[model samples]
Target: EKVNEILSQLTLEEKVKLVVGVGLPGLFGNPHSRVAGAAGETHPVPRVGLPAFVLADGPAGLRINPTRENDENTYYTTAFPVEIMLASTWNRELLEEVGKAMGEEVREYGVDVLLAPAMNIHRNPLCGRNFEYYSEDPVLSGEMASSFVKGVQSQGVGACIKHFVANNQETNRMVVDTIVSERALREIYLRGFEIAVKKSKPWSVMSAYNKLNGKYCSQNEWLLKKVLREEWGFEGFVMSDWYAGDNPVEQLKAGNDLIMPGKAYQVNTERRDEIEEIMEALKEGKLSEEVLDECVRNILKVLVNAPSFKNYRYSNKPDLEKHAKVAYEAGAEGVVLLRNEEALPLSENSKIALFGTGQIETIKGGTGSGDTHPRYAISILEGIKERGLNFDEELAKTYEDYIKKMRETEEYKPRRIIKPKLPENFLSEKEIHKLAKKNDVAVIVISRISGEGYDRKPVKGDFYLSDDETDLIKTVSREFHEQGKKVIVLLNIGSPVEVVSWRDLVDGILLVWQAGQETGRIVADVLTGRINPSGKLPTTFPRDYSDVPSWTFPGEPKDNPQKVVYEEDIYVGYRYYDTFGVEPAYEFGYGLSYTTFEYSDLNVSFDGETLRVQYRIENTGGRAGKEVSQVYIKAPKGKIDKPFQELKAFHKTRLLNPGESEEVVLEIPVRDLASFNGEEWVVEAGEYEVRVGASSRNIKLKGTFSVGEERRFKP
Candidate 1:
């Protein structure tokens, strides 16, 4: 390839310089501009005749610039579904197709490198950027990320898999030291990155902003040079996270080839002097030519193969109709129906009394980086109107007028402005009691919280909800319970919030996690039974904030420099809850559909080294629907302690009609049963239990299997 050819021609000094990239242009372009505006002045700099690379932020859709006035500085891009919404689909082909479309937009904008497909696992629900990440499951994260990489690369665009490893928490990301065990780091946290690199063969990988085991990921020799390069055999360029560097020279030595958004020490003012310092270090035999050659080779490989190098271009025309339809479909597919109580799939002609502010106008997307311009968004009320629901015109009009008046007021102008913190006595019990009497089929409330750049505050219902909102939900439910009317509470927050206390009060509860653009249309589809809800919870919902492992760790205390301890280890989410017998507020992989499914004809066998299992799943319910078959393995007794069950395999079935049946097969290697003993992964000879189910907590069938012989190896 071009990488090897370029490596052969470069001098030691010249090779070292090739490894680093100067600040080229915009982060994510505007929709109108074809090119990212230069981050700094485009002065001529001495270098090998390779084209400079520009980076853009996105894991979902292209973050395109919107206006011609800012065209010089911003590049136009497309805004697609958030990662949280995408993960819910569990459709690899759909993910790949979206990646290809995004690649086309990258080519249209004249960008070289796209910084995306952030595969960080959702370690906790409160991580601000959880919407941009895939899932709590490493297998799902790896599978989805790999498909995206393949699609982007197929379009000749270089894809960069990011935040290297252990980047789960976003709070104090730059300085927080992640003290994870080596075993958990390898098996759970790093598993996705390893799978993505092997399967997709991305052009570059970006190191994270945080420190792992007391050393920054960018300068950690064991991670960047040893594990990634030597063990995984990754021959791609390694770049630091934007402005993520303590020392540039040390970072390069540790195998970080590129420094992004070039800061004070590199690029611009000190460019010549920095190069001279590196050359002197090389001459003194402090840095070897082989190290420099490795960086240059990877850079050349990406540059020559980049989509921009192929001169590909797309029209910057917005496909408003197509995108809106796509948004609605994606949004609808993401809505998870938690409870129905035989009251769902409301008849179109039925006299419906639509309630709640969110029903009239939904909160479109999460805060910070996840926020983007949608071509158009449909309100749930508008969708209900289009579907011709028999809603009272006067009541609907009154709510619309109220919304209009609310928006016109300064209080609601910024969408998510922090109002004057409500007093402890904000909503008196009498006021809450009266508000509950006005509506039938009480839509208790539609609520949202801001995330992304902001940290979730630990105040008593401050960041999550005001005391007033909680009081309202409780009081309204009480009223509805007395009136025999149904109460549906829809939560529109970015991350999971405590709603355990209100579960018994409300008849129906739905957690709609920041669906973008066509959120309203999808919400309507889910409510009206046009589409079945199948979205599984990606992170565990703790019954209370105190239930979180890191809840005790104080944040950014200057004196103590508090660090979060990884006490949970490999057993995260359902694994932790199942192992400790601590019930979650809502189980992982928990979702409800309008139909029912039955499992039968279960079989299990071992072909010496691999275990094969198959089961027949029949849709017995009247309505057609899809089902996710989760297979978990349990080691009855082992040398190394294990979780109650570990998710080994999973398969999502097609939309099966009534009485339709499908046989799903899952194969697990003996190695898949291996447990990480402090230093090495070992599979001890023992009998094991295999459980098949719809969700982690609801096992439909069970079988026994075993690993006959003991085997050990360094992971």
Candidate 2:
């Protein structure tokens, strides 16, 4: 009744304010305001007692301006592992815990909404924002994100799931028009969002900046209405991405309830016309009052759930100490051991030698909105010292001195893209060879950083190893091998790069994808046998950039900047690789554990409505560790062509000691295996092959199941 009562009292002007953002430096601007530096806030209605609603940026953690005017103490939030790394953990329970910590900080910091869990698919390795997203598999991406949403909402802070559809590439993201088949849209691109919206029911959805099919996503009726509202039953209000709505009226009519960073009345410059246009439309009868009322109703319902609307007193100081533990654990579970041949879990007395500038200037997380302002980011050097490990002190000091000098020459810029820094001239060959003689183990850290607003290039430094990095790796490998010592490479990066070039050159490789503030400590723990590596690859690592289906990605801008087609159709990531016989350097779900596990007793059954799979896994190695069990299905190619094998279910076993056995069972709805055949989702009647494995290429168990009849499922 409050929503209706408020609606009855609001004029067109007041309603417009409710839908548009009063961004920074607005009439409500004040250094002391709790909502200061928020992404944006809707204008408050004093008469109705409706307070200004606030939203903030986040995915890894709460991203807000740490410093305030005249505030001596700077406020910082705990930075957690990036989404891709979290997805690699294959642990939904842990993801939910991380989400809870993130939500607590948002609530304590007085933010009504945390714009996070950017659940886009990792379609290609060169996507600059891949670190912010989850995986190439919809089931993995959807389930992980849903768990995170439950955790965030548990703390009374709304989690706004974002970049609504097909935002795969950053190049011309705002202007590119994605031309995808309807069948592909329903199956490949939209399935994850469908699962998330149905499972978590997020408080709000943020529209992407790009165009879908022919129209802007902000004003796409088929997406905002037919699919989101009518088909999937999304009850939340919709908000446009920053500066996305070209026509505010159309956006509202299409069910995009709010426009972010809309306008600041104090400046009256940015998107000012949107306000005036709404007022003129209402007077001229171009826009209906009923549509406006619906939008307001949607916002009010979600707003009432906000911490700000409840007038809860915020302490500003959240349990960063407690949250830091969660951050460390996520990094611990997520760091993937790509290759380890009698080189990892170093002996207690092994003399360590650290290489690269990354040991000092470690990348805790990627840049842009996904990055967090952490209290202090632990570097690899600091982590190694904290672990009480013995390393060459002279070499450490040399790199430390060089990094200190480099830091002095650089200027600080907020949210700027930070490139990977490698040691160029810090050490001479004579010095390296002399250090190699004293050290029994060598660790070379290779770092790469990525952000939003652009796509990564396939050049030497970005996608391929730089000349300096290659030279260092070659020198270290040769010198260490000559001295009969082992060399390990730590890939401190957000996404995949060319690994085949240097993988065989070293004895060990660990893919530590930008684990947040505790990156250094996490790497140290994994190295020192304190924590065993269990994370699996969320995306595939191709042998080269040319092998991927999206090799010609982002299209040729000169030909048509606004038009891009999904030529690959339903084949993406592992789907394309497995189906087309394109061998990847490292297949999806591939990871090496400190311990080995064996699978047996595979069984598959279909009980009319549900398909059930059961298997037994036993630890066959000496160390205690966890293993990710993946279930892939090869559907009958009756009605339409399908991928060679599609991932249907996955489970990560609990930590198991040597010789321990566990029985794992996974159930999936029969309708989940259905394919969209030009119209509705249809399940063809025939034999389906089940492949259970540690990875796409390494199937350990096989079985068969059949569907008796063809069935159709509505969206």
Candidate 3:
């Protein structure tokens, strides 16, 4: 291959430049580079015909600066639903389609890699970046991420799965040492990355900024060498998180192939000696030249396939209209209906009263890497109008007037790492009573937003409902009830907030987690029953923050900045609640629909290696809808203890009309039931109980199969 030939021609200085990134656009290296705001790039080797490869930020969409100086047209990428919502849909095919659309945009924009599909597990509810991640369960996270990778690489752009091992919390992410046991590491924390890496074979893996156990992930030899390279057979090169480490030689020696943002910007400066450090070590024989060559070889191999390196012509126009439809479909499929009584599918001629600042100031996504700049974002008010719904004009105008006046204030300035909440306008009981009498149904929108730098506080405004929000909901709920009208609550949030306290006051609750540019359109569709609500919860909703195992999370403790222990071990998410006999406000995978379904005809079979399951689902109610069937296994008591029930497989069915039925099939390898022991991954021979259900607490069928003999393997 020409990869080695290209490497052979590089000089020592050129080789150092190749491994050390050229830093952020506009500050270092090429001054005239077209991608002025790209995240960073590799050094170019002009004589060898290797162009600099541009890497961009993104989880929601491509995060390049939309406008260039003196450029006439704006370059905006399609903003898709956040990863949590995508995982809630439990649809792999849909994720792959989203990936394909994103990859096309990346290629059109002339970028080499799209840093996205952050597959970090949502171990705690208060994790600041839960919106950017997928689920608490590794199986769901793995499947969704793998499908995304397949879709992205299909378009010739590299897909990077991030935050390499146990980078769960945002607080002190650069310094905290996450102490995880080897068994918990392989089973709970590392499982998703393992599944994604083995299935997707992503071109790059971004090392996390934190320390795993005691060593910085950027230079963890066990992680970068033994586990990732030797066990999983990952052929891709590993790049450090931007400005992740100080010592370049240590990173290279530990198999970190690329140091990101190698040069320092003048406005901000540190680690300017990174290149010199590498060169100095090379001369003293502290770092071998072969190490540099291996790193370059890996980079060059992946570089040849990049859209930029492949000589793809730059066309800024990416099918925005077509991709907008994908965004709409994702929102429509991922909106979870937490509660619905007689209030839903708004009556044909029912008058509506839309309340809350979220109606006019809708949140499209989180801040930092999860944020995207689209040409336009549709608000809930606009979505309602677009749907041709009849809402009380007086109530709508009140919200519009307040938001317009507030926009002129300094509080509405451009946000950075964290997105602040939209200020709510106060409403009196007289105002509520007046609107309740005129409308047949009242709709209230409440929102919450969090991002990269800090964990969410347990105080009223962030995790719990603010006093103003609670008062507004209570006032509206009682007034509407007195007027004989239905009340509905729409949660326009990124993660789960305290709902049980006020959940009984409202008649309906629809969680539309930070969908992208087409959010309003999809919310309107779900409200009017134009699209059925089929999305399920990807994480469990605890009764309170204190009920969660990580309530005393160590990310913020001043005395323990160096160590964060995984005290709960493998009991995370639904696993914790199911194992400890604790009750959650809403169980994992619980979502309401306007219709009902029945599960029947369960069958299970086991060969030596794989287990197969077959079942049927019938739409027993009047309305047409889809259902997600989850398969969980209760491992028998063995030498090593295990959680009560672990998710093994799952499948989602197509929309079925009343009296229609569909047969569903799922297969799980017998080895999948194995647990990591202190020594190796082992499967103890025993009878495994199969529980098939709509949610963790709603099992509809049960069966059993046996593993004849023990099996063992290494990771």
Per-residue lDDT of model 1, residues 137-211, tens digit only: 787788789988887778667788988988876667777788889888877888889889988989889999888
Best by TM-score: 3
lDDT of 3 at 655: 84
Which segments of model 2 are wrong by more than 4 Å?
25-33, 72-74, 264-272, 407-426, 558-560
Candidate 1 vs candidate 2: which has greater lDDT?
A: 2
TM-score of each: 0.88, 0.96, 0.97
* Model 1 poorest ten-residue lDDT run: 36-45
CA RMSD of all predictions: 4.1, 2.3, 1.8
Clashes of each: 12, 0, 0
lDDT of 2 by residue, 1-715 (tens): 7677788898878988898876543234533335555677778888878888778888989988788877785679999999999998999899999999999999998889999889988888898999899998888999998999999999998998888888888888888888889987888778888888999989999999889998888988899999999999999999998878478899999999997767533443444457888888888998998999899989998888788877889998999999999999899889999999799988886889999888887888888868788888899989999888999888899888877776666442222445335445467788889978999999999888888877888888889999888989988999999998899999999999999888899999999889999998999989988899999999999999989897557765734467778888889999999999999999999999999999999889999799999999999999999999999989999979888988999999999999998999999999898989887899999999999989989999999999999999777
Tens-digit lDDT track for model 3 on 1-715?
A: 7898888888998999889887666754446346756788888888889888999879898887778988898888888889999888998888899999999888899888989879888889888899999999999999999999999999889999998988888888888888888988888778898999999999999989899988999999899889988898889889998878657888988778989876644323655567888899999999999989998888888888887787789898889898898888888889999999787899876789999999888889888866888999999999999888999888899888877766666786445543355555478789889899888999999988888877787789888999889999999999999988889999998888999899999999999999989999999989999889999999999999999986547553654566688888788899999999999999888888889999999999999799999999999998999898899999998888899999999988888998999999999987788998877988889899999999989999999999889999866
